[PDB]
Amino acid sequence: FPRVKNWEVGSITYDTLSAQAQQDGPCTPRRCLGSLVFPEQLLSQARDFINQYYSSIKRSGSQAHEQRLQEVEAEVAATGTYQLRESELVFGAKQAWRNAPRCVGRIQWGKLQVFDARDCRSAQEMFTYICNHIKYATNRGNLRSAITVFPQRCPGRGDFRIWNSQLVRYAGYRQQDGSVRGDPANVEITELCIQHGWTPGNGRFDVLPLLLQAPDEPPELFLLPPELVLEVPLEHPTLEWFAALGLRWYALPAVSNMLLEIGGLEFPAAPFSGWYMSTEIGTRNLCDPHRYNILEDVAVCMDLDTRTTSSLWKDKAAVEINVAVLHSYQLAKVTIVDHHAATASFMKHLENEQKARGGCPADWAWIVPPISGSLTPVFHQEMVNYFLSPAFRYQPDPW
Amino acid sequence: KFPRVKNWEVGSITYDTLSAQAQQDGPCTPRRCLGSLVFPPEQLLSQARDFINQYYSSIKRSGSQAHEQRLQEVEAEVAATGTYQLRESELVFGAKQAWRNAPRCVGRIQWGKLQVFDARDCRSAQEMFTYICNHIKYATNRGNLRSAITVFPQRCPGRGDFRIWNSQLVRYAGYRQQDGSVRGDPANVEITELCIQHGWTPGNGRFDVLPLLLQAPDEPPELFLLPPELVLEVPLEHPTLEWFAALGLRWYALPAVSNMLLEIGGLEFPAAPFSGWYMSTEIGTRNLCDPHRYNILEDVAVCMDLDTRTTSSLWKDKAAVEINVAVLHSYQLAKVTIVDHHAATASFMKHLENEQKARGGCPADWAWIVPPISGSLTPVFHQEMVNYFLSPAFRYQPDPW
Ligand code: HEC
Ligand code: HEC
Ligand SMILES: CCC[C@H]1COc2ccsc2C(=N)N1
Ligand SMILES: CCC[C@H]1COc2ccsc2C(=N)N1
Ligand SMILES: [Cl-]
Ligand SMILES: [Cl-]
Ligand SMILES: [Zn+2]
DSSP states (O other): OOEEEBTTTOOEEEOSSGGGOOBOOSOBTTBBOTTOOOOHHHHHHHHHHHHHHHHHTTOTTSHHHHHHHHHHHHHHHHHSSOOOOHHHHHHHHHHHHHHOTTOTTGGGTTOOEEEEOTTOOSHHHHHHHHHHHHHHHHGGGSOOOEEEEOOOOBTTBOOOEEOSSBSSOBOEEEOTTSOEEEOGGGHHHHHHHHHTTOOOOOSSSOBOOEEEEOTTSOOEEEOOOGGGOOEEEOOOSSOGGGGGGOOEEESOOEEOSOEEEETTEEESOOOEEOOOBHHIIIIIIHHSTTTTOOHHHHHHHTTOOOSOGGGOHHHHHHHHHHHHHHHHHHHTTOOOBOHHHHHHHHHHHHHHHHHHHSOOBOOHHHHSOSSSGGGSGGGGBOOBBOBOSSEEEOOOOOO | OOOEEEBTTTOOEEEOOSGGGOOBOOSOOSSOBOTTOSOOOHHHHHHHHHHHHHHHHHTTOTTSHHHHHHHHHHHHHHHHHSSOOOOHHHHHHHHHHHHHHOTTOTTGGGGGGOEEEEOTTOOSHHHHHHHHHHHHHHHHGGGSOOOEEEEOOOOBTTBOOOEEOSSBSSOBOEEEOTTSOEEEOGGGHHHHHHHHHTTOOOOOSSSOBOOEEEEOTTSOOEEEOOOGGGSOEEEOOOSSOTTSGGGOOEEESOOEEOSOEEEETTEEESOOOEEOOOBHHIIIIIIHHOTTTTOOHHHHHHHTTOOTTOGGGOHHHHHHHHHHHHHHHHHHHTTOOOBOHHHHHHHHHHHHHHHHHHHSOOBOOHHHHSOSSSGGGSGGGGBOOBBOBOSSEEEOOOOOO
C-alpha cells in the first residue's frame, strides 16, 4: 500500500484504493513513464461494474443484485454484449469522471447532467442532441456540467463518432509563409472540414463546423448556430490597450473525442463538458508557442524589456494575460475558476475521497497548473496514478 | 520495446534505449505510478565490474590488458578484504557520472566541468572541517561560482562512517518561538535544535548561519563555526520597488548539498558534499514563498498594495514574480553567479539533445525539472521524460541520529 505525503502540511496517508487498479499503466520498476501524454473479459468487467452499482445504492448481495448479474450474463452469452439500465448509465458516467486522474475539477463529480442519446440513429440526430447539450450546459453563462451518451460500440456495425476534439474550437488556416491564422492546434481538423465541403472563413476565431459520423457512413458537416455559441471578448482591468487586441474565447469546454467505458461497454461518442479553469485559456491556449503564441506581443505592449530573460518579462506578461481572462469572464458573467480556487477545492476532493474510498487516482503533472505551480496546494502533495473503471479513454482518430 | 519520448511543442521524437540498462528499481509498477514521491559480496563485485567497464569504456580502452588487470585487481581486493579502493582517476570519473545521472538536476549541461577534491585521506572531524572550508573557498570564488565536490573516506566494514549532519554547508537557523511561530527558516528547526543540544549558543535573527556538525567515524559529532568572511551572502533588493530592500531579506550564495550518499561501483561514500550555483526560482519562489518556509508572499503583495481580498486577482502570482525578479536583480548586482528558469531550462534541453547522441537517453524527473513557477513558459514542460536510476549516483540516506 503506497504511502502518500503532503510536504507543506506534513500529514500522510495510505492509498488502499490503488491496490484495486483495473488496467495497467506505462510504468515499471525499471523506469517511470508517468509524464507521457498517451468475452470472458467483457463479463469480468461487467460483473465488477454491476457490483459497484449495487454497492452505490446499498443493495449489495440482494436478490435484485443477483438477478441483474444473471441478466447481464444471459445477454452477453446470447448477443456478445448487453444493454445498461438508465440508472446504471448515469452512475457509470459519474464514476468515469470521478476516476479521471487528470481532472483537477473532480470536487464536482456528483453534479453531472446525463443525456441518454442511445436511441440516436443518424448524424442529423447527433447534431440536434449536441445542440441541446450545448444550450443546457451553457445556460446563458452559468455553466452546468453535462455528458451526452450516444449508441455503444457494436458487434458488426461501425461506431458513432464526433471527429472534432471539442464541440467548440477555432479554425487554423495555414497561410502561405508557413504561418497559421487561427488556432495552430486545429489545422488538421480545419482541413478535414474543408476537404468535406466546407468553405472556410478567414478570421482568427472562426468556430469550426461539426464533423459527425453515424455508423458506417461518411461524416456530415453541421454548423452551430452562433446564437448557441457563447463567447467572451478579452479585456484587461487596467491595461486599456488589451481590449483592442481583439482576442476572445468560447465559454464552453466540451471534450468530444474520448471514449466512455462502462462495465466492459464502450461509447466511442459521449461528449462531456463543464467549465474552464483560467490557466487553460490564459496560459496554454494563448501562450503556448505552438498555440496562439501572443506572449511576446503582449510584453512589448507592456513596454517590458524582452532583451534579457532574467527580467522575467515572460512571467509578467503571462500573469497579466491570465488576469485579463479572469477579469473578462467574470465581467461577461461566464463561469470560470482560477488555479488557486481550483487547486484548493481539489485538496478538499482528495480528503473526501480518502474517507470515501481510501485513495484517489491523480496525475501530478496534470493537476498542477501551468503557472505558479508551487504557489498552489497540490504542488506539495504526493499523488498516486492508476486506472480505474468506469473511465474516460483516449482513442484513435476515425480517419 | 524502447520508450518513445515526444516533445509536444515541436513534435520531435526520440527513443530512450538507455533506460533498458537501468541499474536500480523504481517505485512505479504497471499497477500504479508513484513518480511524484519525494523519497523512493557478489552484488558488490558485479557493481564494481560494471563500473570498471564504464571507466575503461570512457577512455576508449575497453578490452585492453590494463582493463582486464584492473578487473582482476578489484576482484582480489574484495576476496581479500571484502571491499576495494578506487584510483584517483576513477573517483573523478565516478563523481561526474553521479551528477550526470541525477534525474532531478536541471543544471546537468555543466556535468563534465565538475572539480573533484580527493579527501579520502581525512583522519578526523577537524580535518573534515578544513576540507569543507577549502571547498567553500574554491567553490565560492568571490561570487564567480565553480562546481565542485569533496569526497571523504568511504563506508567501511567494521567501522563507522564520516557524516556531515547538516543537510547543507550553509543554512539559516530556525528558532521555534514560543506561540507556534518560527524565527528563521522553519525547515532547519530540527538541525538548529541539534546544534544547540550539542553546545551551540544560538542567535535570534532570521538569517543566522548555522554551525557545522561534523562526524568522524565512531565519534559523537563535533561542532564547528564557519568563518563569516567565508559565507558569501546577498542582500535582496528590488530594481524599482524601493521598499523591498527595507525588508532586510538575504540569501547565501553557495548551494551545497552535504547529506546525500555518493555511490560508485558498489562503494558508498556517506560524506561527499557537492555544490554549484542557484537557479533563481529556488530562492525567490521556494525558500521565500513556500508557506512552510520563509513564507513572505502576503507581506510583499501587501507592500505592492495588491488586492489580496480575492484569489482571482492573481496577487500571489504577481508578488512571487517580483520576488524572483528581486533575487535575480540582487545576485546580478552583487556579482554572484545565478541562473533564471528560462535559461536553465533552455540549456537543459541542449543537454537532453547531447545525451541522446551520447548514450541514447537521459534519466529525467519531469516534476523536478519543471520550475516551481511559469512551468509551460519554459521548454521542459512540453518535453516527455523517462525516469530511471543509473549508477554511479547521488542517493538519499537516513539521518545519522
Ligand atoms: C466541473 C468543471 C471542471 C473543471 C474546472 C475541469 N474539469 Fe475535467 N477532465 C475530464 C477528463 C476525462 C480529463 C482528462 C482529460 C485530458 O487528458 O485532457 C479531464 C481533465 C481536466 C483538466 C486538465 C487537462 C488539460 O487539458 O489541461 C482540467 C484543468 C480540468 N479537467 C478541469 C473529465 C471531466 C468531466 C467528465 C464527466 C467533467 C464534468 C469535468 N472534467 C469537469 C471539469
Ligand atoms: C551547475 C549548477 C547547478 C544548477 C543550476 C543546479 N544543479 Fe543540481 N542536483 C544534484 C542532485 C543529486 C540533485 C537531486 C537532488 C535532490 O533531490 O535534492 C540536484 C537537483 C537540482 C535542482 C532541483 C532540486 C530542488 O531542490 O529544487 C536544481 C534546480 C538544480 N539541481 C540546479 C547534483 C548536482 C551536482 C553534483 C555533482 C552539481 C555540480 C549540480 N547539481 C549543479 C547544479
Ligand atoms: C479543451 C478541453 C480540455 C477540458 C478537459 O475537459 C473538461 C470537461 C469539462 S471542463 C473541462 C476542462 N476544464 N478542460
Ligand atoms: C538547497 C540546495 C538544493 C541544491 C541541489 O544541489 C545543487 C548542487 C549544486 S547547485 C544545486 C542547486 N541548485 N540546488
Ligand atoms: Cl481549450
Ligand atoms: Cl535552498
Ligand atoms: Zn511512474
